[PDB]
Amino acid sequence: GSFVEMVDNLRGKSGQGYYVEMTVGSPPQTLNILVDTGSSNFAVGAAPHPFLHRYYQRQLSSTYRDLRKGVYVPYTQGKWEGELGTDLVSIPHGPNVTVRANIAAITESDKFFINGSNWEGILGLAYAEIARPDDSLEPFFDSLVKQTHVPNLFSLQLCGAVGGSMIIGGIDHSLYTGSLWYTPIRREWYYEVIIVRVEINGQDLKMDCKEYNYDKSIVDSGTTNLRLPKKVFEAAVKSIKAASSTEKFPDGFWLGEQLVCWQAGTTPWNIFPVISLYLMGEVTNQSFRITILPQQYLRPVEDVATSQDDCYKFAISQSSTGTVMGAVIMEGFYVVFDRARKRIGFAVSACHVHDEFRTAAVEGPFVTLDMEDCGY
Ligand SMILES: COc1c(C)cc([C@@]2(c3cccc(-c4cncnc4)c3)N=C(C)C(N)=N2)cc1C
Q1: How do 286-292 and 195-200 pair as beta strands?
Q2: With CB atoms counted within 10 Å of each terminal CB, which end of the chain scores lower, N or C?
Q3: Does 2.40.30.60 match the CATH number of domain 18-150?
Q4: Strand partners, 168
Q5: CATH number attached to the domain at 151-376
Q6: Which residues are catalytic?
Q7: What SS3 class is residue 34?
């Protein structure tokens, strides 16, 4: 269960998350589980569903323990419900350990599972504060750290086209180039961070930095898009439209309602600007930036029927729940969730995005003297 054996342990489909293989129960039942830094439950499909290839069968596990507690999770566009219990859990291409963990056996759901995603459950990697029904339900990673000698850290190397790596208990130096820059975890609930500055093709958006973090900024592998608060989304779209003015796209493209297509191999990457997110550093008024190319924010939509063309969805969207640095932001970066030191490291990954003109980057330090607190 070394780091080499953990390399390439993730798979996925574009816009459908990254998943890792796990086993639940005795004898082990193999399931594909979404790696989610934006939630804190280990929630697995435990009843038949038209989108599930397989599911957790509690009756077949001798080690299953029922907690006699239901869990009901409604949200805007859907819901999931289930029963809480505990069982033996392993990650075959992860640490060489078996732990007893809480499991939310999903019995009913609406618009939760995805057709052809190839995953059957979600591994919520965030803190107990956001666990459902409440903070007393110990998340998986907490159980793993308590029961084993595994260091309190994990890292994610999400690669586009999908695949990548989840390294538990350490940093795999073969997965990144250059320096690892750290941003403090503001509060241990979601992986909450602070954005101090936003530039679009080197041009500062010129907003009070609190606007970037209205009402929180999080690092979420379970969200596809870069999600931005209304004011920031509007200014970003205006700036991207201006840089890409040689071509006009429908309003629906800017809203995520429609694809933009070009003849295969002709995508005009150069008309689209680079987006720079400046993250709060580990020392006062110091920051570093992560640079996002259009190869990350224009997500390819694979469709045999549109295959004479290369088609893309605009992977930046409006949020009313704060900034979300989703999968398109994480892609090409090696992201260290250093729980032990309450910080998140970013470095250029071995699968980073680039063309012959520009590259995705992690650069610093940047100083500011006229800075307030950028948090809410
Ligand atoms: C606590 O209950 C939840 C909720 C409310 C949301 C998510 C989910 C979620 C749920 C179902 C599918 C996905 C999903 C879909 N497409 C791509 N990646 C992930 C995400 N939604 C977000 C924003 C997230 N980070 N995880 C997971 C769980 C377990």
Answers
A1: unpaired
A2: C
A3: no
A4: 154
A5: 2.40.70.10
A6: 36, 220
A7: strand
